[PDB]
Every structure is written in structure tokens, then in C-alpha cells.
Write a protein that binds this ligand. Sequence first.
Ligand SMILES: Nc1ncnc2c1ncn2[C@@H]1O[C@H](COP(=O)(O)OP(=O)(O)O)[C@@H](O)[C@H]1O
Ligand SMILES: Nc1ncnc2c1ncn2[C@@H]1O[C@H](COP(=O)(O)OP(=O)(O)O)[C@@H](O)[C@H]1O
Ligand SMILES: [Mg+2]
Ligand SMILES: [Mg+2]
Lengths: 512, 512, 170
Amino acid sequence: SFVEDYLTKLQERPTIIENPNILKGSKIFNAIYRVDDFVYIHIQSIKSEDGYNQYNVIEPPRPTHDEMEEIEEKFALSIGDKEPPEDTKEKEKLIRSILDKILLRMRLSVPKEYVIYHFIRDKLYTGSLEPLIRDPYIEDISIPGLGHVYIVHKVFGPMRTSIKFENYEELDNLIVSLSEKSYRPVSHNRPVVDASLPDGSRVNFVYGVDISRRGSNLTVRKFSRVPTSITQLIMFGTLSSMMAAYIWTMLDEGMNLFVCGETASGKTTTLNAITAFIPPNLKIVTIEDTPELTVPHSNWVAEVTRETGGEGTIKLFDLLKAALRQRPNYILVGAIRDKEGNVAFQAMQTGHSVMATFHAANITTLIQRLTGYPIEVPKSYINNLNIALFQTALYDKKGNLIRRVVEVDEIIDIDPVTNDVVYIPAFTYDSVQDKMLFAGKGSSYLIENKIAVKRGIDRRNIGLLYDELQMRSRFLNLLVEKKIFNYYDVWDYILRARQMGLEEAIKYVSNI
Amino acid sequence: SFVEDYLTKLQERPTIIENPNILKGSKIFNAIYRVDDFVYIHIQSIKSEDGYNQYNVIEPPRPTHDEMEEIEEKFALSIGDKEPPEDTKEKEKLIRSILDKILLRMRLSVPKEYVIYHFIRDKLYTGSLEPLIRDPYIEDISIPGLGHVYIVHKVFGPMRTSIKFENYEELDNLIVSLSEKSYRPVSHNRPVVDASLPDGSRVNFVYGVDISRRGSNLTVRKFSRVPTSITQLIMFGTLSSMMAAYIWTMLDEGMNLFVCGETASGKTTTLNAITAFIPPNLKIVTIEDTPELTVPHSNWVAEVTRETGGEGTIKLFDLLKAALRQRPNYILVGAIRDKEGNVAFQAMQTGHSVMATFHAANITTLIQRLTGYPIEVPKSYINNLNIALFQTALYDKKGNLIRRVVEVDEIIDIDPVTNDVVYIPAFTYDSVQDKMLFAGKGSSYLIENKIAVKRGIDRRNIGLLYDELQMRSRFLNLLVEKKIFNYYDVWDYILRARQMGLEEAIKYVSNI
Amino acid sequence: NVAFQAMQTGHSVMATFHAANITTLIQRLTGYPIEVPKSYINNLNIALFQTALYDKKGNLIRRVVEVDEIIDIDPVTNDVVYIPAFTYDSVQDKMLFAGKGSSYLIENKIAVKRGIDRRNIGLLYDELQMRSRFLNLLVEKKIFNYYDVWDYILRARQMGLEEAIKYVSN
Ligand SMILES: Nc1ncnc2c1ncn2[C@@H]1O[C@H](COP(=O)(O)OP(=O)(O)O)[C@@H](O)[C@H]1O
Ligand SMILES: Nc1ncnc2c1ncn2[C@@H]1O[C@H](COP(=O)(O)OP(=O)(O)O)[C@@H](O)[C@H]1O
Ligand SMILES: [Mg+2]
Ligand SMILES: [Mg+2]
């Protein structure tokens, strides 16, 4: 068969899996896995001098150019007047039929099925890129110009694929047909185009050698349908169970919270994980430039921006303004860096809860950038933001990149005398022991001065809040210990905890 | 009956109740309350796993799809060239008649009265959302995308209803159809629309999967056709009786006044309330992007902008220019933001009084924005605007949201040494004691340089003006004490005060 | 302005800019039409300055005259704080590592990422010295072609510095 045909020509035969997660940290490998019928992936860890491992795409052989052009011809002549009907799925299963009854009397080189696959892949889908689209372990796809297609793999990082573009014309035809298929055709007049693929991936096209001098280029950004969960983050060591419990307590009470950090620090991942702590019967509105977030709540409005060059442009600013008319309980802003930040604080000021990510290493930098142009949050408004957490990518002792929350700050106010932010570090990070340090039971301005007054608690009864905090930490630990990691499983158990109560939920989980 | 039918399919029967107010606090129940003769609501005390109570709409059964198609097509074939009348009642009268003719000769799968309910519901009203609109216990309605319609119920809080939208295009059609019925169609170019349903409920639309990625979404917020009155605003603490008396005095004398603040600070609400102070026999032209102002005056031109995506588009600017030829006494502009601001001041310079809402937190910012791009009011004309009030949202000590007019400024001049506004703060606010402060006696330039001169009172009998002011404050305080809060009742009492004098008015209303 | 937007969204950036020194650079970055607000200026970490100078025979040479690390904003003056990591001694025609042992980017960015205490910073300066040693060896062996040099840098990435140094030394 086509796989074994490939698989026999290899000097050293690759093993079998179907999930390269096992290889995490394995710097040596030679494996092959399924994607679809007609698509297998052979990953081999060569000692490539420029540090790319190999990602080999295994597809059915192609009929000769002559066969195709003959099949194209005979096909084009059919359904002439006839219009290609709307629906994608039952009107794909039509092009099939027509293929059969023009192939059934043809002497073909390769087996028909394999002819079918290539005809369909190129006509109805993303052609040679389709295996990469179909592969759930790929996050970025780049065709920078002439040469190989490059990807970023979640396990392996950047890899070089076996797919190769040798001429400008192939490249052009790819960018043109895909952009047309995405209903946003490129032209020489407007050669730069952003669009969505049917699977929801985002694609950027740049068309014409006069603009992309190594040949027309594209970039596909794919998004995970299943976000990393809060128990995974705890297991990774990125947050402690107590820290996550603290966040849970705060989101349960509608606190406003920014997840901050600099390049690739994991802000969006942490944001998506802690979203599971927002009470499940509430309305969440997400507003993003890029559709990265997946919210488990049923009452979830998900909005994205649109840039048209002028008329019809919809910005984050516009969507946050509209969110004030949408009765949200939480507004989640993908990332703040412009005037939408001002509207976000006005949303906080008028009874709406907000979370967002922001690119900044520490609270001083965060406040300076929020109060500066272009965001222009007034100092008198900064107090609306209750929690700023900062995380960063660091190396561990083995040289591996890890992500860590390095500080969690409770914002109290800006000092009128000094114009400096008054805040309390709720958590800090000890890099030596690799542990999150909790400031403790007498430490939280938010618990004592905000929540206590909210939940109608007297000072004598303040320990009951710290007690529930402790119980939440216990529950999260038990989830981790029982290996409850999948985002939706974790959501289910959070919901269970809310339904039966923490004390009883802990007993239930203890006995799995 | 359609209801009794429904009950028989149930595992166990719910108790019939007059209204859900009795179920309040409780959580072990099972009830059916009546909305219309066609709408009964079944409420289930057993939560879903995500903590939503279930709100089940009991409607009469629908005709088959082919029956409905047959009816629509026949309805369309009758009358199909003629345009329907604008009057909603006459419209419905016509539709029922025509419908009665078509159905008379038909053999229906369900009773006639049921076909009629559903036809009228979908054609004239809000379709499957109509039961929610008609239930007075519904506060908010959300369709966040594909899935159920979610609501906020006055008794039960968030609930999941039995209404579902499972098809992108059907959801698009709903948003398009409802926006068209709201007199403000969405388009792909302008996919975000704020408007009001025919019943007066505010609605926000977001159109197209390219912007709302889980499907077109909407939010309905119910609330009185009766606008909040000035006596209610005093009782809320948003402004004092003296502040209202001041504004009343100023509008009596044709002063120009902007209501300023951030979004959702309550500016439109305050403008609508103080409009009741404009003398009753005057011409009012309102100019808005969507109607919010409910003017009680008889001589009221209500104009609204229009976006067509091409020819026929009419903006605030165009309407404001036309107002110069319409002999209004007051022009009320819903909000001023762009070059229409310049025309508003042209209106002032040609003898028309103007009020508007504007986005600015203080007088300094207001003047910077008026004089800068794109408004560009020349500096020497800025003092045509007499009064700016600034309103903001805040939290009190308990954490409750409140809205307060925090400053009232009289605009005197722009200082040529150099370009700073000369103004007088006639009122300010003490945020600690939550109190409004008057400047006050012999502080107002407008009282003692415009009104006194017109009157024409000497600088030593100026007490007469401040006595009329203290007088108006007492009358307003009296209305609050006697709980005269309804907008139109307050209007009547104001007109009554005009038509027998303050002294006689205070003394009257003291009795009740 | 968009280059700074790119830094603020987690993309690294390099660029050339026509300016003689950090003061001029910052005036131009913060002024019209670039208009980067001061609070974002320190997204740019390093500014290097290079000039055409005359040699003693009156021919043109190019020299890096300063390398500046951009730190943050001074709370008293509202000015951009920077420290020179390198300066140029025109009389000896030598680059001075003025930031040696006191570089902000080395201690507060690099060292922190590596979890290296303020008291073990010497390890980073050791690694730097080995990098320099390697670059000298390439020069000594007349490895000048851009692609040959690129190959050796990659060889150093692979294999590691110490034995790349051994291989080059031969
Ligand atoms: N806690 C973590 N542990 C390990 N990897 C992570 C963690 N958080 C994020 N990542 C990975 O790091 C990269 C950047 O994550 P992202 O959430 O997009 O960061 P940012 O939002 O700060 O740009 C992604 O590849 C993501 O899968
Ligand atoms: N003084 C007030 N007190 C309490 N609620 C108010 C007040 N003014 C307005 N609101 C409510 O606040 C919300 C925003 O009001 P609106 O007048 O539309 O503000 P803006 O015009 O500034 O956007 C509305 O739901 C309205 O009912
Ligand atoms: Mg308004
Ligand atoms: Mg990011």
C-alpha cells in the first residue's frame, strides 16, 4: 500500500505511535503517525545543521500531469451551464459521483482512490497544505517564499516539512486559489490579504514577487479547540494550587484581573485556563484580534475585529463599546494596548467585570503604560483593576523553557502624594526552590476590604473566607493527583464543586 | 387546550401560580404561570449542571412548514404590490383580515387561532422571542450565538430557555429581520447596531460570523417607555433639588448646555429628564442616531440618521444643518462627537438654543475636544455654550453603583493669555459625604450678568433671583416627598407651576 | 510606531535609524510622526551608534561609537534612562566594555531568565568571554565569508561553544 511503499524504502524503519506528546524532551526520534485516510506523518530527528527536525508528509502517489489535465478537461465539460450548488458537504459528495462516472472507463496509472483524493484535495480543500491543516499538532504554517513549507509543532517546535515550492508560479497559484477559496481573493492592486479558512484557522497572504521578493508567501495560524486547563498549569508548576484557588475565589466574586508578562510568557493560556473559575451561569463576552480563546460557558458571545483599510473596520474599541450594551458579567479582552483599554476601565467602573492580557513585566510598567497615551486610563480609575499577575518564560536548571507566575499584585490605589501605585504582592516566586510564596492569611486587601464587605462578612468571620480558599486549593490538588487534566473534565468537576459544595466535592474526588 | 396537552407529557405536574414572585427565595417548586392567553411559562426548580434554572415556554403548536410556506406565498400574492400602512395597529388590522380570507378556505394541521398566533408573531412581532418580550418578569434576553436563548429573570436570575437557534443562516436572518423592524438594519459594512424594538426595549445587534464568530448575536434589555424623570434623579442623589432648580432656571432662559461624562455615566438619561424644563409651547428638534429622547412637548420634530452604504446616507451633521431652517427653539443632539459639533455652535450663533451629550470628564477636556480636530469650534465662539455639567459613575462605601453630577460649570471665555477657558464652577461634589455643593450666593455669572440684566434687576435686588431659585428647589423637593416620580406627571406639575406661579404651586403641592 | 506595536505584541525587532546618539534617537521616536509614547520606549532594549571617521591617513573607517541599553523612565525628570554598555576610545581605537559587571540587560533580563542569582552573574560574563574567544578564532583562521561564518555559528550552536572552539583551533 502507499504507506508501506514509502515505509519500506527507509534505511531505518520508524516506530509507531499516534501522539508525539510522549516525545516531549526526546531529542532523538523516528516515528510515523496517522492523520486521515491518505495522510500519514513521519517525524525524524536528523542532526540538521540549522536546527530543524524533519516533518515528512506521506501521501498517495499522484497521477501524471497528463491524466489530471485529461480528468480536468472531461470534468470541466460536464456541469457547464450548471451552477456549483451552495453547501460544502453534500455538494462535495457530488463531485465524487461525477469523478467516478468519468474515471470508470479510464486506464489510470495509480489506483483510482488515490486519484480521487488528489483531485478533491486540490479542488475542494487547501491542496498540498491540507495534511498540515488536518494535523492537530501543528500550530503555525509558513511558506516564506521559494523552498520548503515550515511549521511550528507543539511538541517539536519549528520543523522543516517535506513539502517544497520550486517556482514562483506554483507559489502564485497557491496564494491565488486559497485566497479565492477563502472568499478574499488577492489582486496585484491589493496583494496583502487576511482571511479565515473553513476550519477557523487564520491565514495571511502576500501576493506577487514585486511585494514578496522571494515569491508569494503565506502564514497560517491554527488554534487549539481544547485549551490547556488550570490543573495542567498547576502540574506544569506555572501556578501553585493555592494561587489557582486564590484566583478562583476572586473570579467567583467578579474581581477584575489582568494576566501580564512579556514575549511568549503564556498570558493567553493562563487567561483561558482561569476562565473556568467564572460562575457557569453568567454571560461572558470575548473580544479579540485573533480567535484564540475558547470559553466553556454556554452564554458566550465571541467577537473578533475586522480591518478593511477604512470603511467597515471594526476595532477592539468598537467591540468593547458594544459590550456595554450586552449585559456581560465578564468582558475578556484578548490583549489591551490601545484606546479599548480606556473603555475597559469604564466598563469596570460601571459594574462589569473584566479580564485581559497585557504585555508588561511588572506593575510599575503596567500602570505607566495604561495611564499613558494611547490608552489614557485616568489615575482615578486604576483602582478598578483589582489583580495584576505577571508571568514569564524562564529556563529551568536543565536549560528547558518553563513558564512561571512570578508575582500576583493586589491593586489598592494610586497614591495622590507620590502618584505611585499602592499595591500588595499576594504571591511571589522563589526560583531556587521553584515555589510560589503566598503572602498568607492576614495578607489580602481584596478578601478583607472588598469581598468581606461584599459577601456581608464581619471581621471575626474573615477566617471562613480563608478556609474556603484552603478548601479550593485542596480540591485543585486532588484534581491534579487524580490526573483530571482535560479542560472540559476540569470544568465538569468545578461545576460539580459548585453544585454539591466544596466539602462534599472533595470527598467525591478523593474516592475516584 | 395547548397547555393542558403539554402538562400530560410531563413526568410530574407543576402547580399553577398567578406569578413567580411567590417562588422567590424558594428552590423546591414546579410551577406554571400565565403570560398571554397564548403564553404559559413552566419553571423547573432543578438546576442544570451549569447552574441554570430552566425556563420553558408553552406556546400553541405550529402549522407544518409546507402549510406556512403556502400561507406566506398566498399572503404575498395577495396585496403583493401595495405597501402596508405605517400605523402598527392599522397594519395588524389589515394583516389579520387578509389572513382570515386565506385561511378560511384551508384545511389546517392545527386550529386556526393557532396558525394566526404564529403567523402574526413572526410577521409583525419578534417571532420566537415574543413570549420573552411579553413576560414582565424577563429583564434581559441574550442570543450569544448558536444554542439556547438565555435570559435574566427578575425572580430566578439567569435561566436557560427552551428556545434554540441551531443554524447560522437562520440566526443571521433573525438579526437582519429584527434590526429592520427596529428601523435600523444591520449590514456587513456596519454590523454593530444599537436600536430599540417596537415595544421600547433596547436592543444590541452584532451581525455576521466574520464578527460574531459563534453566530450573529443580540441582547435585549427591557425598560420603561417612560423615561426617568428629574424627581427620580434627585431622589437617586444624582443631582440635588437646587441643581435641578438651577438647570430649570437656565432652560427657561434659552441657555445652551452640554451633559458630559464617560460612556454609561447616565448622560442621555439626565438630558431626557431636564428636557422637561424647556417651556411647553416651544419647538424642539431632536437629532439622534437612534431614538432615546422621549420629548413631552407637542411641537416635536424627531429626526434620526440613516446609513445605506451609499447614496441616501444621512448623518447627524446633515440633520443639524437642516435644523437651521426649521425654526426650532431647542435642538437636542443625542451625542456630539464629530463635525456636527461645529454646526451645533453655528446653530447657537444663529439664535437657536442647543443641548447635547458629550464625551468629556471635565471642562478642560471638553474645550480641548470642541476646539480640536475634527470638531474645530473656533475659540471666540466657545462661550456661546453657557453650561457644561459633568456626570460620572462611582461606587459608594458598600460597593453599590451610583451616578453623580460632580461639577456644573458656567463658561465665560477663552483667555487670550493664553488659550485657557475662563469658567465658574456653580456646583461641585463632595465624594466623601456624598453631597452636592453650591458656590453659590452671588457666584453665578449667568444669573448675575445674563438673567439679572434681562430682568432687569439691580445688583442689590439680586436676592430676588436667588429667591426664585430657592423657590424652584422647594417645589421639586415637594414633588419628591409626595412621590411624584412618573415622567409625565412631573411634566404636568412643571406646566402647572408655569401656569399659576411658583408661590401658588409650592403651596398647592404641599397638600397631599 | 508599528515596529513598537510589534514589540508590544511579542515580536522582536531590529531596524536601522539615521541618528547620531540616543538623545536624538529618543526625540525622534517620541516626536511626530513616529509618536512612540515614553512608557513604551523601553520595549527597545539596545541602541547601537556607528559613524564614519577618518583614519590617520585620512581614509574612511566605520566605528561603533556607543552601545546603549534603554532602561526605563526617570520618575523625577520623566526622561529616558539609559546606560552605555560600550563606548569608543578614539586614541587607542578600542571599544570599551563600560557595562562590564554592571549591565542592566545582563543582570535584570538575561540572568533572571536563567534563574542566576545576583551573586553568580560571573557565569554569564564567562559565557560572553567564550563567545568572544570563538569570534577571534574565526578571525585568526580567516573565516570571513558570510556563509562560512554562518556555518560556524551554527556549528557552535550544535556541539556547544567549547568544542566549536576546539574544532576551529583544529
Ligand atoms: N504554562 C505553560 N507551560 C508551558 N508552555 C506554555 C504555558 N503557557 C503557554 N505555553 C506555550 O507558550 C507559547 C505562548 O503561549 P501564549 O499563551 O500564546 O503566550 P502570550 O499570550 O504571552 O503570547 C505557546 O506555545 C503556548 O502553548
Ligand atoms: N442617575 C442614574 N441613576 C441610576 N441609573 C442610571 C442613571 N442614569 C442612567 N442610568 C442607567 O444607566 C445606564 C446608562 O444610562 P445612559 O443615560 O444611556 O448613559 P450614557 O448616555 O452616558 O451612555 C442605563 O441603563 C440607565 O438606565
Ligand atoms: Mg447616551
Ligand atoms: Mg500573545
